Amino acid sequence: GSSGSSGFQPGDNVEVCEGELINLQGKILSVDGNKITIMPKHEDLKDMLEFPAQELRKY
């Protein structure tokens, strides 16, 4: 099998620092190199989203 590429790992709780989706917290699902696919914690939203490591920040 595999272990885990070098970088950030999904599952941790992070939030957006800059951008339009600022002040947006949520859990990480996976890590796509420069892009990070996660899912925001909001009822209004019923789907997952992907943001750049730059937009997302670990708090």
Q: Are 36 and 51 in contact (CB under 8 A)?
A: yes
Helix (H) or strand (E) holding 37: strand 35-40
Tell me the H-state helices in the chain. none
- Other beta carbons within 10 angstroms of residue 36's beta carbon come to 22
Method: NMR
Look at the domain 1-59 and name its fold: SH3 type barrels. (2.30.30)
**Domain boundaries of the chain, sorted by first residue:** 1-59
* CA–centroid distance for 48 within its chain: 10
